Amino acid sequence: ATLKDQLIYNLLKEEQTPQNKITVVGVGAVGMACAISILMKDLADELALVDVIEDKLKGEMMDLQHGSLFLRTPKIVSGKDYNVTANSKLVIITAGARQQEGESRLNLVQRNVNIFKFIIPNVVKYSPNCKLLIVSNPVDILTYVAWKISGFPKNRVIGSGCNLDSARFRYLMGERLGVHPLSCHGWVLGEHGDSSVPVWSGMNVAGVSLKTLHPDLGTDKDKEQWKEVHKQVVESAYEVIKLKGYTSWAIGLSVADLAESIMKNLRRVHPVSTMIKGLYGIKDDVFLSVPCILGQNGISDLVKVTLTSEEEARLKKSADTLWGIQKELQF
Template sequence: MQKSASASSLGPGGLDLSDMFFKPIQNTSPPSPTKRRTKISVIGAGNVGMAIAQTILTQDLADEIALVDAQPEKLRGEMLDLQHAAAFLPRTKIMASTDYNVTVGSDLCIVSAGARQIAGESRLNLLQRNVALFRGIIPPLAKYSPGMILMIVSNPVDVLTYVAWKLSGFPSNRVVGSGTNLDSSRFRFLIADHLDVNAQDVQASIIGEHGDSSVALWSSISVGGVPVLSFLEKQQIPYEKETLISCGPRPETPLALPPPLFLELLEHSKKG
């Protein structure tokens, strides 16, 4: 004789409530048949790396996010923070490890890991320390995800992007750096603030190497497509820039907010 369902599990009309309410959550929303699964790995769980991971998560840019860092306790804490927030965000699998094998099958790897510049340290010394770190980072990433796009945001970013290209053995069109994105973002903000307009309406660029040697394209500045060079007081812009630097800007936020760039890189990786 078959055992009947317990009264506690039956609702009105004899419906089995246990089957209705206690099915695994992941099975209630089947994956889209048209969406290709995407995996993004972030190397370095510092301020910049975690800001990037949060952007990927909140913008629903990937089905999987893998975090790698050399400090296991910090890494676990950062992973838990993202996993707890994921209850209110799109369904993304979040994993973390000190081992690079967690990045296997990535479409995009973003490297933010790097040594911090010590007060009085030259960029050359910083470069030497970060090149040593990259020798242990880039080869395993290339091994576990040979078809990925590799994006570098560690400083000095332009030289380290070249180093990453050489260490990876990838074609040059699959290794990119954040370049002067941060410089251009700050430049646009300063102009927008001076003219009391929205920064999204400002078209302005910084080119060259990220850092002191970069160049502002003054002649191409426009607001809503209208040239504004004649309206700018050139002496005030450098002063405001110097003030911004002395206030101690946090570079992680503007570096982490270019979803269109992520999407373009992911689309490129899908095309191979």
């Protein structure tokens, strides 16, 4: 006899399991930018947020819920407990430890391993069949860590890797050429961040190879200094941090694009971090970015890119370094 009862007749109460649920672990600037971008792209019928800071977590959940009128994602939930993440198709990890001043790489990585040791088994408990997308840095090593802890098959553990680096590269390329980034093609591969590799041979507009038109492209004898574009990719990341104190929007949008391919089974190709053992004379269990076909099974295939000697040596050097760190990790 309540108002709801007067107004609404119920036919059935049954089931109700999310069909396209996504979880974001960690609700810092990066996690929440991933969340808003995913929400505005209608990728999920349920979004779950997890963090260890409970106040912050509740506030972010409520803020998103309050915009429900303007969205098409009918259920947004959160909690410190992983039961809220049950039955996720895709779980995106942005949680981790921030590197201290003077702190060694091994030490920082070890701190994040200890964090993943709590996070990953809980994610797996509640969504045994999800794809894991790792955003946390250092992304290539932490993708390895998530893979190691989860026990997932290689296809279901994806690192955001060089996706953002490549998007920045295409923005800068577009600016130089006066063309939309969508029509400017180019690939930054290997280790995410400072050591990434710009594959000059693949840079093209409408299938016209820039390297072929301009053989000095990428080299030190290039009067147009196209090498500076890749340098600006690296520099701009530290610049944004210096200017606003963190980065969020671009990473959020790039993560949503990966999630789109995965959730809708598109099988588009993105530069993301995957287990690269067997390529480029790499014989250790290390993850680096190559172009990968992404769909409902995660990474079902990868593209074998022909690299120059110098490009190959750079990936190989990254692989040697990552393994040097990984082999000393305590799981």
